[PDB]
């Protein structure tokens, strides 16, 4: 492990070169010493605040919220130093870590970061206040390289369909729970109570994991099937018949 540490009692203008010495080592190790590197960049929001602080002292035409107008082209020269190259057996994976101001995902920093990175993992506050760990809200989370990393011969043939159906069920259950809390606990239909039981068991059994628990992928998929078995097999429209026939009746 190599550490570069800029604490909150340290100079602010160093934060501009800190993510670039950490990404120049990771590039030497991966593309010259041929190892697989994992780069963590903690508070990519402090870096942008230092950027704004230097741009405001130069009397430049400001962007949105005061951040520089070239913050997109600046974050893209940090985020785009990741991947594999031909002929060399090394890689670089990047996991930046933002904190959205006021839990706002349309702030300039999260907005511009979303235009550059391949997805995002969304840590929610509503799930935190109900003692769920890890409090990951899967509805605005996304991974754009998933379709080509999963499936038959890589993880298991039922991965994508289980994931799609779990997502659709969670969405429908949230849209139910809204008006259930609003208009009528008894005006709920007979199946508008299966989505609520799915909500509860999915947030307590699939999401909530444990701070030292290491699940395989196949355990995750088995729990997903145990949750999908709440619904009669006619309500799973996002799963083909060949997969339902092989995995549902257990």
């Amino acid at each position: 492990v190599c550490l570069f540490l800029n604490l909150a009692n340290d100079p602010t203008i160093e934060r501009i070169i800190t993510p670039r010495l950490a990404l120049t080592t990771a590039e030497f190790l991966a593309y010259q010493c041929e190892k697989h590197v994992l780069v963590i960049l903690t508070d990519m929001s402090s870096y942008a605040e230092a950027l704004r602080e230097v741009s405001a002292a130069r009397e430049e035409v400001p962007g949105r919220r005061g951040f520089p107008g070239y913050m997109y082209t600046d974050l893209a020269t940090i985020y785009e130093r990741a991947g594999r190259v031909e002929g060399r057996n090394g890689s670089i994976t990047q996991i930046p870590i933002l904190t959205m101001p006021n839990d706002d995902i349309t702030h300039p920093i999260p907005d511009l970061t979303g235009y550059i990175t391949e997805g995002q993992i969304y840590v929610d506050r509503q799930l935190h206040n109900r003692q769920i760990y890890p409090p990951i809200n899967v509805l605005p989370s996304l991974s754009r390289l998933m379709k080509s990393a999963i499936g038959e011969g890589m993880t298991r043939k039922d991965h994508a369909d289980v994931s799609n159906q779990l997502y659709a069920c969670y969405a429908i259950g949230k849209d139910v729970q809204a008006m259930k809390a609003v208009v009528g606990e008894e005006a709920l239909t007979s199946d508008d109570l299966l989505y609520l039981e799915f909500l509860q068991k999915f947030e307590r059994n699939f999401i909530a994991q444990g701070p030292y628990e290491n699940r395989t992928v196949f355990e995750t998929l088995d729990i997903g099937w145990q949750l999908l078995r709440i619904f009669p097999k006619e309500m799973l429209k996002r799963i083909p018949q060949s997969t339902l026939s092989e995995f549902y009746p257990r």
Partner: protein, 206 residues
């Protein structure tokens, strides 16, 4: 001795916090506890109880030294301290001692000069670090750091600077962070092995 108020006094090491800061309130002791060496913020509108919470905390807590910074607030709230505290006492060895024998105030009220609201904050946190170095556990009440932010915005306006958010300078968060990063439990610089601590409780006035 003489010390620059903008340079942090050195230590040997910063340790983790393992002991409670007992206020006198049922809530804030049961549900949201602070520790000896932590950092707290009390945001609220006007008339909510930031000053009463701060003054009760400074009267009844378990700290050895209390520094009270009144930064841009009422001048009748410093006369309530200079009147109440010489009457309250605490028991040590059978003898009773007033709680003003261990308190220091730094007052810059709201009609005093606006540029001295900054110099007030740094004057308090440098007295919290002089006593912590002796081996004491200090608590520092900063009443309305929002007045410090307003002083910063005023000075930045007189300089014709580019605002950042709602008028404030772009370096407001840096000042706030480097001020709150002076609170903690420490192993004190020097050969006799001591252990000190400085807690900060900052009121915000949105």
């Amino acid at each position: 001795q003489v010390w620059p108020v903008r340079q942090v006094r050195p230590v040997t090491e910063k340790l983790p916090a393992n002991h409670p800061l007992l206020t006198g309130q049922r809530v804030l002791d049961a549900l949201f506890p602070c520790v000896q060496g932590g950092t707290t913020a009390i945001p609220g509108a006007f008339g909510c109880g930031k000053t009463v919470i701060s003054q009760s905390l400074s009267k009844y807590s378990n700290s050895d030294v209390i520094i009270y910074v009144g930064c841009g607030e009422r001048g009748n709230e410093m006369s309530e301290v200079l009147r109440d505290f010489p009457e309250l006492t605490m028991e040590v060895d059978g003898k009773v001692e007033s709680i003003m024998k261990r308190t220091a105030l730094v007052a810059n009220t709201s009609n005093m000069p606006v540029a001295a609201r900054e110099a007030s904050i740094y004057t308090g946190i440098t007295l919290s670090e002089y006593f912590r170095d002796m081996g004491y556990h200090v608590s520092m009440m900063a009443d309305s750091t929002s007045r410090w932010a307003e002083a910063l915005r005023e000075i930045s306006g007189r300089l014709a600077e580019m605002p950042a958010d709602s008028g404030y300078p772009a370096y407001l968060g840096a000042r706030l962070a480097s001020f709150y990063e002076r609170a903690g439990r420490v192993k004190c610089l020097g050969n006799p092995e001591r252990e000190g601590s400085v807690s900060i409780v900052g009121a915000v006035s949105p």
